Design an enzyme around this catalytic site. Structure first.
Site, PDB file in Angstrom:
ATOM      1  N   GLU A  13     -13.194  20.263  21.439  1.00 52.61           N
ATOM      2  CA  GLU A  13     -14.559  20.691  21.085  1.00 52.61           C
ATOM      3  C   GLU A  13     -14.527  22.036  20.355  1.00 52.61           C
ATOM      4  OE1 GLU A  13     -17.226  19.073  21.063  1.00 52.61           O
ATOM      5  OE2 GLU A  13     -16.969  17.425  22.474  1.00 52.61           O
ATOM      6  N   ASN A  26     -25.233  20.332  13.490  1.00 51.80           N
ATOM      7  CA  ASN A  26     -25.294  18.873  13.396  1.00 51.80           C
ATOM      8  C   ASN A  26     -26.225  18.463  12.261  1.00 51.80           C
ATOM      9  OD1 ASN A  26     -25.349  19.227  16.960  1.00 51.80           O
ATOM     10  ND2 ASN A  26     -23.558  18.701  15.671  1.00 51.80           N
ATOM     11  N   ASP A  41     -28.688  16.586  12.247  1.00 47.90           N
ATOM     12  CA  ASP A  41     -30.080  16.531  12.703  1.00 47.90           C
ATOM     13  C   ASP A  41     -30.738  17.918  12.844  1.00 47.90           C
ATOM     14  OD1 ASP A  41     -29.110  17.482  15.196  1.00 47.90           O
ATOM     15  OD2 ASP A  41     -29.962  15.969  16.415  1.00 47.90           O
ATOM     16  N   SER A 101     -29.782  20.258  14.917  1.00 46.22           N
ATOM     17  CA  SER A 101     -29.346  20.911  16.170  1.00 46.22           C
ATOM     18  C   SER A 101     -27.987  21.597  15.942  1.00 46.22           C
ATOM     19  CB  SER A 101     -29.260  19.908  17.338  1.00 46.22           C
ATOM     20  OG  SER A 101     -28.251  18.932  17.097  1.00 46.22           O
ATOM     21  N   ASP A 120     -24.268  22.866  18.095  1.00 43.40           N
ATOM     22  CA  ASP A 120     -23.435  22.858  19.315  1.00 43.40           C
ATOM     23  C   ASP A 120     -22.839  24.242  19.520  1.00 43.40           C
ATOM     24  OD1 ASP A 120     -23.839  20.098  19.411  1.00 43.40           O
ATOM     25  OD2 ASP A 120     -21.990  19.605  18.436  1.00 43.40           O
ATOM     26  N   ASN A 151     -25.140  21.148  23.112  1.00 45.51           N
ATOM     27  CA  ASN A 151     -26.079  20.914  22.002  1.00 45.51           C
ATOM     28  C   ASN A 151     -27.483  21.412  22.289  1.00 45.51           C
ATOM     29  OD1 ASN A 151     -28.033  18.656  20.570  1.00 45.51           O
ATOM     30  ND2 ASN A 151     -26.368  19.405  19.264  1.00 45.51           N
TER      31      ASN A 151
END
Ligand SMILES: [Cl-]
Ligand SMILES: [Cl-]
Ligand code: NA
Length: 129
Positions: free
Chosen positions: A35, A46, A48, A50, A52, A59
């Site tokens: 990660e 991301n 969309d 959002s 992380d 998220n």
């Protein structure tokens, strides 16, 4: 903070991740490797909109507030910036909520694609724990 492998294993163990919801410590160490490359300050946007955050790439769509994920939730009740701290407490506490959420560690795409079904114990091999 960029953790060493065994150093993170130890910190994760101390914060009660080892076998949390049945997931052995190597699972958590492997997820963090893929990660974040063990980097508490990691962030990734991301498609969309959002983002992380942190060692476990939590998220903003569901788990933390970053003030720019319109329509999102903050189910960990934290600013996403708390997830970037050198101290992994906030990330751990939030991960424990996430892994309780119903799909277990499958919530972590990197865990599903790079850790699940592999020899995850290897990630804690040789560590003084
Ligand atoms: Cl937001
Ligand atoms: Cl599970
Ligand atoms: Na949010």
């Amino acid at each position: 903070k960029v953790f060493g492998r065994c150093e993170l294993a130890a910190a994760m163990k101390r914060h009660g991740l080892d076998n949390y919801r049945g997931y052995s410590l190597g699972n958590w160490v492997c997820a963090a490797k893929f990660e974040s490359n063990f980097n508490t300050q990691a962030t990734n946007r991301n498609t969309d909109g959002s983002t992380d955050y942190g060692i476990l790439q939590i998220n903003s769509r569901w788990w933390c507030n970053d003030g720019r994920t319109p329509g999102s939730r903050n189910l960990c009740n934290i600013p996403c910036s708390a997830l970037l701290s050198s101290d992994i407490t906030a990330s751990v506490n939030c991960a424990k909520k996430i892994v309780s959420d119903g799909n277990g560690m499958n919530a972590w795409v990197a865990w599903r694609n790079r850790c699940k079904g592999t020899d995850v114990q290897a990630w804690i091999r040789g560590c003084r724990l």
